[PDB]
Design a protein around this ligand. Structure first.
Ligand SMILES: [Mg+2]
Lengths: 289, 56
């Protein structure tokens, strides 16, 4: 048994159903098939029990055409059709945080997630704020558990989108940049600080806020600007920001603060301000109640 | 129908986004077939046939 058994000897490429040993061709083809699987997955009925079974069913549908172990957890020994047996009870991180659950810690953690969702009835019959506070605890825990050999982020995100949908809310992760995701997660894992993650879940659940970030991202694409490496967020109620006026749109306006993009509602600007405001102007904005 | 276009738009945006959050950009044939379904010029059965037949 060995973690090494997941990759072709003398390479860094994961054994796959296509037999691609060249890393980038494997990535493009696995990416292509996983796109196909997500579109079709969007057509299945939502489960009655959100649990570890459902998590593994999602991973299995995403990666079944790529990996023999689609849907298998990494601390359970998996035997390839070639005869070798792989597992990775400990998956070390280069340079990173407190890292990931090890071995039996994965198992315990998943049992806990199973118990919690079950006693709280899949987080249903809650308001949006209630749902988000519960969801955040489960999301941080699944972040640490990281139970699959590969594809953990994609499976977890789909799990929490569908979980919110069945509880009558939404989580729109396509509005979150790679930068902001990493800031929020390491604030949890490193500093014990939940605020960035709570603010993340608020921006992508609040309908008023989703409209604003939708417009901003749409503009960025039409501009041909890639913000995946920058913080993008909606101004928090009561906070003040000071920076460079970035322009305005039908629904919202953008502020630029030490490289970050801060989105706010146009109706919250003083109309005596909006009138003469030019891109590059230095403005201060306090978001209201 | 508009509601359906809404659904598929979100669905392709989510596919693209969830890879970008891993540092992955999709192959241009992948983006072309996805965009044809979001528009959509293609039913889901046709979109699946074109994803199956793409040569990367
Ligand atoms: Mg991955």
């Amino acid at each position: 048994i060995s973690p090494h058994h997941y990759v072709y000897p003398n390479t860094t490429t994961l054994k796959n159903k296509y037999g691609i040993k060249n890393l980038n061709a494997f990535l493009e083809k696995c990416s292509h098939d996983t796109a196909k699987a997500m579109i079709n997955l969007r057509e299945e009925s939502l489960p009655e029990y959100f649990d570890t079974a459902y998590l593994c069913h999602i991973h299995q549908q995403l990666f079944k055409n790529t990996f023999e172990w689609a849907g298998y957890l990494r601390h359970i020994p998996f035997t390839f059709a070639d005869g070798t047996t792989a597992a990775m009870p400990e998956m070390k991180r280069t340079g990173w945080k407190n890292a990931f659950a090890i071995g039996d810690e994965i198992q315990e953690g998943l049992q806990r997630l199973d118990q919690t969702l079950a006693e709280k009835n899949n987080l249903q019959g809650l308001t949006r704020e209630e749902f988000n506070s519960e969801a955040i605890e489960l999301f941080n825990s699944l972040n640490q558990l990281h139970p699959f050999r590969e594809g953990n982020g994609r499976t977890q995100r789909l799990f929490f989108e569908n979980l919110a949908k069945a509880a009558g809310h939404q989580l729109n992760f396509s509005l979150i940049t790679k930068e902001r995701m990493m800031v929020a997660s390491v604030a949890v894992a490193e500093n014990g600080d939940l605020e960035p993650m709570q603010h993340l879940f608020e921006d992508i659940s609040n309908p008023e806020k989703i409209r604003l970030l939708k417009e901003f991202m749409h503009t960025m694409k039409n501009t041909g600007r890639n913000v995946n490496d920058r913080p993008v967020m909606v101004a928090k109620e009561g906070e003040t920001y000071t920076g460079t006026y970035r322009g305005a749109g039908l629904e919202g306006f953008a502020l630029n603060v030490k490289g970050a993009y801060i989105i706010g509602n146009i109706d919250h600007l003083p109309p005596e301000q909006l009138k003469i405001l030019k891109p590059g102007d230095k403005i201060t904005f306090t978001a209201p109640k | 129908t508009l509601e359906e276009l809404k659904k598929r738009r979100e669905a392709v945006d989510a596919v693209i986004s969830t890879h970008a959050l891993e540092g992955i950009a999709l192959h241009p044939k992948t983006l072309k077939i996805l965009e044809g379904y979001a528009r959509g010029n293609t039913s889901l059965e046709e979109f699946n046939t074109l994803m199956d037949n793409a040569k990367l």
